[PDB]
Design a protein around this ligand. Structure first.
Ligand SMILES: *[C@@H]1O[C@H](CO)[C@@H](O)[C@H](O)[C@H]1NC(C)=O
Ligand SMILES: *[C@@H]1O[C@H](CO)[C@@H](O)[C@H](O)[C@H]1NC(C)=O
Lengths: 116, 117
């Protein structure tokens, strides 16, 4: 499998303009982004996907601000960023699933809102 | 670039109840991008037995050193076998998508369970 540097949960307040949910594969050996496929899941739904082969990103309308930095993929960073407006509406357990050729893995991070 | 083969070398495996069953599978290519999963039987109501996702299958363990990019062995070991584990097991390649789609399957391995060694 692909192995992850795991995080139980991440907190955000209104200080956070953009929200970042971390996802770090510890054993990426990818030559190219065309070998890699990312899926971010929330409440059973694919709310972000990146197809390296096609070099295309796909979001549902209620996660329109959701994205990853494709520049950082080869380093093993698949962290999801969305506008705080989207984040407050969608708190809970997020699945980050990475594929590299045939190797496959996932990890879960709870996005928590803290009141200040 | 040879059109992918998914090869289960054993057509059948025989094991005593309580022993472990090594179900063998190897691939000739690692493309297209997408994972290997083990099912028991084929068809719509087929049962998922193993994939590489951590802690989802406590009975099944990777026989291969499958954490390496170079790995093309997807053989698995099913511990504490009982007659309820009997059936045909299939090694199936998938293409990535929403959702993932079956690309290629092996010919299958048929596990049978003796009462005594
Ligand atoms: C919110 O911002 C703080 C810095 O003020 C940062 O440490 C924290 O990780 C951010 N949270 C998220 C979920 O982005
Ligand atoms: C997220 O998952 C953890 C561990 O399974 C669970 O304790 C928690 O209740 C879940 N959170 C939500 C918001 O469902």
């Amino acid at each position: 499998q692909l192995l992850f540097n795991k995080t139980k949960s991440v907190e955000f307040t209104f200080g956070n303009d953009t929200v970042v949910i971390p996802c770090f594969v510890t054993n990426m050996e990818a030559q190219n982004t065309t070998e890699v496929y990312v899926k971010w899941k929330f409440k059973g739904r694919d709310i972000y996907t990146f197809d390296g082969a096609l070099n295309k990103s796909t979001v549902p309308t209620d996660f329109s601000s959701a994205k990853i930095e494709v520049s950082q993929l080869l380093k093993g960073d698949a962290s999801l960023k969305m506008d705080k407006s989207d984040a407050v509406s969608h708190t809970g357990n997020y699945t980050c699933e990475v594929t590299e050729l045939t190797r496959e893995g996932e990890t879960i991070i709870e996005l928590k809102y803290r009141v200040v | 670039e040879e059109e992918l083969q998914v090869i289960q070398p054993d057509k059948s495996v025989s094991v005593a109840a309580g022993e472990s069953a090594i179900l063998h599978c190897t691939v000739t290519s690692l493309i297209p991008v997408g994972p290997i999963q083990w099912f028991r039987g084929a068809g719509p109501a087929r049962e998922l037995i193993y994939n590489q996702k951590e802690g989802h299958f406590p009975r099944v363990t990777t026989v291969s050193e499958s954490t390496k990019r170079e790995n093309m062995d997807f053989s698995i070991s099913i511990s504490a076998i009982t007659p309820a584990d009997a059936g045909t097991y299939y090694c199936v390649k998938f293409r990535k998508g929403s959702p993932d789609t079956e690309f290629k399957s092996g010919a299958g391995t048929e596990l049978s369970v003796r009462a005594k060694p």
